[PDB]
Every structure is written in structure tokens, then in C-alpha cells.
From a paper:
In this study, we elucidate how the natural peptides Ang II (the principal end-product of the renin-angiotensin–aldosterone system), Arg–Pro–Pro (the BK-derived peptide) and [name]-potentiating peptide-b (BPPb, a snake venom inhibitor) bind to the active site of [name], revealing novel interactions involving several enzyme subsites. Comparison of the four structures clearly shows a common mode of peptide binding to [name].
Therefore, it was not surprising that the structures of [name] in complex with BK and [name]–BK showed Arg–Pro–Pro bound in a similar fashion in the active site cleft. Furthermore, the side chain for this residue is stabilized through contact with Tyr496. Additionally, both structures bind a citrate ion (from the crystallization medium) at the same position, making contact with the N-terminus of the bound BK (1-3) peptide. The two Pro residues at positions P1′ and P2′ form a strong interaction with [name] through hydrogen bonds with residues His497, His337 and Tyr504, Lys495 respectively. The general mode of binding for BK (1-3) appears similar to that of Ang II, particularly through the various hydrogen bonds with [name]. Experimental evidence suggests a preferred affinity for Pro at the S2′ binding site and highlights the importance of the hydrophobic pocket (formed by residues Phe441, Phe511, Tyr504 and Tyr507) for peptide recognition, which allows the products of BK and [name]–BK hydrolysis to shift position and ‘register’ in the active site subsites. In both cases, complete hydrolysis of the peptide to the end point resulted in clear visible electron density for the tripeptide (Arg–Pro–Pro) in their respective crystal structures.
Numbering used by the authors: 17 to 614
């Protein structure tokens, strides 16, 4: 009888979820030890325990067939069983899974161990991406120096792992097909529980794309005035090494040379943070303060005891790209961040604490539900707070922004600064997964893999390498997430929905009213708002217990992912920028790049 079996199934799930949490704890501890301290021994430990968990997952997926779960009355039970059928990489045969783990750790460790020689001192070769190289890329205005560090990094972080990346693509594809997905693209897209998700994103992107073109055109115009026409052409793609970021993903670091009104204030609180004696500990304490001020959960003692919030001063290798960790017990959550005292890093702290808050909010859920409504939701949480932290309103409250006059021109400066991070990022994020999807789907021949990457970067972002590349180079893995096998569409989703969350949180806080000039969206601070916090609690506590539109509905009553909010935020900028580009006869669009030889 199905009635009797469904009762037994509920008991089966309750026990299994608890077992899965406990087994995942062990894997997470080994992964933590490796990420904090990269050694051959720790790699072996991490990968052996993962292989053990994978074997158990196989048994679980096999055991689900003993239950007639598709026939059950409970949508909740059926959802849990469905989650258990999805094996991912664990679907691979024992030997193939072990090889993939070896391949993945080889790529991540390569990225983490990259060291380059100093541009001025060829005998000093201990410059790592974080913080040495990134500091130069963000601060230097010497185009030849920038080009040097670009080439050195991409050669070492990208090209060096071509063979490993090829095997990764093969095994990822094999895994996807064993789960009966067409490719790893479909496997990744399954996390969004919507068969029209790609088209939805194409539609939203197409709406925002014209604004991006205007920003691109204006930045190119301003860069020409700084570097001269020998470095930057009017009609070509922007040389990417000039954009203040190794991957040209966000351009805020060059705001001082491209700001609409250079004689008016531009928010850069890094210097005032240092003057006031800010430390990584203080920054995390301030993040904790922001969450608690919204009536959300305080960081547990385990977080303070076990987190790594500064780059270790011994000679050891580690993954410095910031991460948050859920150990699937009670209150055992951690962050690993090589944090520096800068404005950008203050946002990163809040970003990572957003993940931690999500962990704490759903820790009461059964194991399979202890994850985000979709991957984009998890990435969005901290960014909503970062948007308010970034406002002149908030920065003045914490004494980091002094003698600031918020006139029309200063507002345009701030909107443009935000756009250099939020709008600029959209085509970048889309191309990261458009690229990997095309490889996963077998749409690009191996002989064309590198120029296929740069073709997308050209088509969507209108940027190009500083030097001519070819199929002898392999540049994609020079981006952390590509070497680390981290799906990237989550960030495109995040950057869209975070404005939906921000707008609604601001309205709930009484901080935004479209008909009130005194309450603009771009100066909303949700600090101290219990009303905004309540919306977060209602959504985050759900975890993955319901499809993501139900989680969005819990927040603000909406069920649709929409670009309306992000466009609303930047509308005052759009109006000004379109007019400024016409006034200055600014060329919009770009010719096809010549920087990748087929
Ligand atoms: C991805 O898709 C794959 C298909 O492309 C899929 O692989 C299939 O999984 C099926 C299991 O659901 C499996 O079906 C079984 O087939 C057995 C015989 O197959 C052999 O010969 C085939 C050639 O004809 C070969 O290709 C195979 O390699 C095999 O050598 C059958 O013996 C078996 O049957 C038994 O089970 C059914 C199922 O019963 C169900 O559950 C209850 C039980 O209480 C029933 O009441 C209910 O009605 C329901 O039917 C019983 O009905 C029956 O009495 C037997 O006990 C079964 O049909 C199939 O072989 C396999 N491969 C192929 C090529 O089809 C993967 O599972 C998919 N992967 C994922 C992750 O989803
Ligand atoms: C700082 C630190 O924790 N270092 C550890 C070290 O103690 C250990 O010997 C090694 C084993 O591979 O892993 C690393
Ligand atoms: C001032 C305020 O609204 N405080 C809320 C309280 O009403 C609510 O009961 C609690 C539950 O988490 O969260 C907090
Ligand atoms: Zn994140």
C-alpha cells in the first residue's frame, strides 16, 4: 500500500538527511583544511573522503528506486526524493570520479600557486595575484606595466592548465550524461528549475545592453583622453588591461579617470578606513552589526574562533579567493578571506557574510533543503547590504565619508561608479557561462577553444587582450571560477535579482519612494530596518524547500525574475549619459577584435 509506504518514506528521509549532513561535515572539514593549507597530503585527504561520500551517494540514488516516490501525495516528500536522485559528479565510475577530483585540485592549486616576477625587479618573483598583482592592475596607469602583468598572469594561470581543463570538460560531460542531461550546461541549468531560464536571461540582457553600450562608449572616450589614441582607438574594442581589473569584469578602479564630474566628490573611503585604524576584524564586526541591526542572526562563536580573515604570514600556499563555509551541524560556519582594508573589500566582507546568514537561516531545514532557493539567491544576499553600505547616506553615518555635498553632479558620479560595477558586469558574467556551455555542449572544436573565448568577450563586452593571443594560449582558466569549476550564471542572476531585493527592502524600510525626491533608490540605507530583515528571514529560512519563485514571493510577493528594478535604479544615469554622449559626439559600438589569431 502506498499510504503505508509514504509514512515509511518520511521516516527514511528524516534519518537519511541527518546522515548526509554528518557525512558532508567530514568532507567539508577536509576541503577546508586543503583550501587553508595546500599540500599534497591535504589534497589526498580531501579527495579520498570525497570519493567515499560519492560512493555513499550512489547507494542513496539506488535506494530511491525502492520507493514509489513519484506516486506520493506529499509535494514535500517528492521534492526531497527528487533531490536525492541527482548525483552530479558522483554518478561517475569510481576511477573516473577519482581522476576528476585529481583534475579539479590540479587546476585550483595551479591558480592558487601562481607567482610572477616584478616588472622592475626581475629577481623578485614572489608576486601573487592576491594581493600583489591585483594592486598593480587596480592602481597602475602605466599601460606597458599593466600589459606585462596581464601577460605573465594569463600565461601562468590560464595556458598552463589547458590539458587538465580538456580532461575536466570530458569528465564533466560524461558525468552529465550519466545523470541523463545532454551536457554540463543542462546540469548547471537544472538548479534554476525553469526550462525557459536561458531565454529569460537573453530577454533581460537585451533590455540592459543599450545602457552598457553607452557606458562602454563613454569610458572608451575618457580613456582616449588619458592614454592617447595610440593606446585606445575610437572605434575598436577597449584594451582590457586599462580597465582596472585583471578580467575587465568590473571597472570601478578607474573611476578617478572616467568620472562624469572630476571636480565633484567621488566616493573612495579606503584612505579614511586606513586613517581610522580599520582592521579585518573590525570590518567583519561591522558586517555582523549590519545584519543584527536588521533583526537578523548574529555570528556564532564558532565563526570568530575558526574563520581565517587575514592572509597567513607563513610561507604556505592557500586559496585566497574569498569563500564561506557551512559545516552542516549547528552554528559551525566559517569564512576564509585574505582581507585588506579597502572599500571594495568592505563589500566583499558583506557579500560573504550574506552566505553565512543564509547558512544560519536555513540550518533547521532537512539536509537537501540546506542550500539557496537557486544559486543566484545565495550570491545576492550580501550584495543587497553592500548596495546600502555603498551609499553616501551610510558611509557618512559610519564616518568614512566626510564633507560630502550630494548635489546633481555628485549623484551622477555615484550612479556611474555603481554602474561600473553593476552594469559593466552583466555581459562579462553572461560570457563566462556562454563559453563553458558551448564547450560542454560540444559546439566548439578543440582547435578553436581559445579564440572562441575572446570572440565572446568581444561580442558582448567589447573588450580585448592587450597583446595578440592565439590557439597556442588558453586564457579562460585565468579566471578563478573557471579553474575552480564554479558555475558563473549565479552571478548574472544575482546582479539582476539583488536590485529586486534592494528595491523591495528599501520600500519596506521607508527609504525609497519614486514620487519623493528626498528618497531616491540610489541613496537607500537599510541599516537598522527590522521590516527589511523580516523579508530576508521569510525568504532565507526556506532554503531550497520550495522552487525559487516561491522564495521570491516570500520576500516581496513577486514570482518573476525581472530587469525592471535594475533599470529603475540606473534610469537617472541613463538619461544623463545618453545626453552626454550626444553632446560629446561619442562613438558607440566596436569593430571586431584582431587580438586572437585563429
Ligand atoms: C537514464 O536513462 C536510461 C535509459 O536511457 C536509464 O537506464 C534504464 O533504467 C531502467 C530502470 O528504470 C532499466 O529498466 C530495467 O530493465 C531491465 C532489463 O534491461 C536489460 O535489457 C536491456 C535491453 O532490453 C538492456 O539495455 C539493459 O542493460 C538490461 O540488461 C528490467 O529487468 C527491469 O525490469 C524490472 O523493473 C521494473 C521496474 O518496476 C517499476 O517499479 C515498480 C516495482 O515495484 C513497478 O511496480 C512499476 O510498475 C515500475 O515499472 C519492473 O516493472 C519489472 O517487473 C522488473 O522487476 C527494468 O525495466 C533499463 O534497463 C535501463 N537502460 C535502458 C537502456 O533502458 C537510466 O536509469 C537513466 N538514469 C537516471 C539517473 O535516471
Ligand atoms: C599552518 C598549517 O596548518 N600547516 C599544515 C602543517 O601543519 C601540516 O604538516 C601539513 C600537512 O600536509 O599541512 C599544512
Ligand atoms: C522589532 C522587531 O520587529 N523584532 C522582530 C520580532 O518582532 C520578531 O518576533 C522576531 C522573530 O525573529 O524578529 C525580530
Ligand atoms: Zn558568493
Amino acid at each position: 500500500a502506498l499510504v503505508k509506504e509514504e509514512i515509511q518514506a518520511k521516516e527514511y528521509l528524516e534519518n537519511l538527511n541527518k546522515e548526509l549532513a554528518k557525512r558532508t561535515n567530514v568532507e567539508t572539514e577536509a576541503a577546508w583544511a586543503y583550501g587553508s593549507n595546500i599540500t599534497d597530503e591535504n589534497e589526498k585527504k580531501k579527495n579520498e573522503i570525497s570519493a567515499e561520500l560519492a560512493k555513499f551517494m550512489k547507494e542513496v540514488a539506488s535506494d530511491t528506486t525502492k520507493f514509489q516516490w513519484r506516486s506520493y501525495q506529499s509535494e514535500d516528500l517528492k521534492r526531497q526524493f527528487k533531490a536525492l536522485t541527482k548525483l552530479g559528479y558522483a554518478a561517475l565510475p569510481e576511477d573516473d570520479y577519482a581522476e576528476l577530483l585529481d583534475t579539479l585540485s590540479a587546476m585550483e592549486s595551479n591558480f592558487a600557486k601562481v607567482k610572477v616576477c616584478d616588472y622592475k625587479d626581475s629577481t623578485k618573483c614572489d608576486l601573487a595575484l592576491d594581493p600583489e598583482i591585483e594592486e598593480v592592475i587596480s592602481k597602475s596607469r602605466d599601460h606597458e606595466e599593466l600589459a606585462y602583468y596581464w601577460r605573465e598572469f594569463y600565461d601562468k594561470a590560464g595556458t598552463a592548465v589547458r590539458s587538465q581543463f580538456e580532461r575536466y570538460v570530458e569528465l564533466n560531460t560524461k558525468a552529465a550524461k550519466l545523470n541523463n542531461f545532454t551536457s554540463g550546461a543542462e546540469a548547471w541549468l537544472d538548479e534554476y528549475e525553469d526550462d525557459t531560464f536561458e531565454q529569460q536571461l537573453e530577454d533581460i540582457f537585451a533590455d540592459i545592453r543599450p545602457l552598457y553600450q553607452q557606458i562602454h562608449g563613454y569610458v572608451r572616450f575618457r580613456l582616449r583622453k588619458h592614454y592617447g589614441d595610440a593606446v585606445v582607438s575610437e572605434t575598436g574594442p577597449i584594451p582590457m588591461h586599462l580597465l582596472g581589473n585583471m578580467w575587465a569584469q568590473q571597472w570601478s578602479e578607474i573611476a578617478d579617470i572616467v568620472s562624469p564630474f572630476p571636480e565633484k566628490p567621488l566616493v573612495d573611503v579606503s584612505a579614511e578606513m586606513e586613517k581610522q585604524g580599520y582592521t579585518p576584524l573590525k570590518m567583519f564586526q561591522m558586517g555582523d552589526d549590519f545584519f543584527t541591526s536588521m533583526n537578523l542572526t548574529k555570528l556564532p562563536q564558532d565563526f570568530w574562533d575558526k574563520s581565517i580573515i587575514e592572509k597567513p604570514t607563513d610561507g604556505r600556499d592557500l586559496v585566497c579567493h574569498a569563500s564561506a563555509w557551512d559545516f552542516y551541524l549547528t552554528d559551525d560556519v566559517r569564512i576564509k578571506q585574505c582581507t585588506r582594508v579597502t572599500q571594495d573589500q568592505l563589500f566583499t566582507v558583506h557579500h560573504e557574510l550574506g552566505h553565512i546568514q543564509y547558512f544560519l537561516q536555513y540550518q533547521h531545514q532537512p539536509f537537501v533543503y540546506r542550500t539557496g532557493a537557486n544559486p543566484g539567491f545565495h550570491e545576492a544576499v550580501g550584495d543587497v547590504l553592500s548596495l546600502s553600505v555603498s551609499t553616501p547616506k551610510h558611509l557618512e553615518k559610519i564616518g568614512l565619508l566626510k564633507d560630502y555635498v550630494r548635489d546633481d553632479e555628485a549623484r551622477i558620479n555615484q550612479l556611474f561608479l555603481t554602474a561600473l560595477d553593476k552594469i559593466v558586469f552583466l555581459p562579462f558574467a553572461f560570457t563566462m557561462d556562454k563559453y563553458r556551455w558551448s564547450l560542454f555542449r560540444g559546439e566548439v572544436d578543440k582547435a578553436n577553444w581559445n579564440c572562441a573565448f575572446w570572440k565572446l568577450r568581444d561580442e558582448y563586452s567589447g573588450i580585448e587582450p592587450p597583446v595578440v593571443r592565439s590557439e597556442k594560449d588558453f586564457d579562460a582558466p585565468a579566471k578563478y571560477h573557471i579553474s575552480a569549476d564554479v558555475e558563473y550564471l549565479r552571478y548574472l542572476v544575482s546582479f539582476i535579482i539583488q536590485f529586486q531585493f534592494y528595491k523591495s527592502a528599501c520600500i519596506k524600510a521607508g527609504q525609497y519612494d519614486p514620487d519623493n525626491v528626498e528618497l531616491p533608490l540610489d541613496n537607500c540605507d537599510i541599516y537598522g530596518s527590522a521590516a527589511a530583515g523580516a523579508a530576508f528571514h521569510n525568504m532565507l529560512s526556506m532554503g531550497a524547500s520550495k522552487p525559487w519563485p516561491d522564495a521570491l514571493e516570500a520576500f516581496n510577493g513577486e514570482r518573476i525574475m525581472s530587469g525592471k528594478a535594475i533599470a529603475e535604479y540606473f534610469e537617472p544615469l541613463r538619461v544623463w549619459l545618453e545626453a552626454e554622449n550626444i553632446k560629446n559626439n561619442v562613438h558607440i559600438g566596436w569593430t571586431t577584435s584582431n587580438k586572437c589569431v585563429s
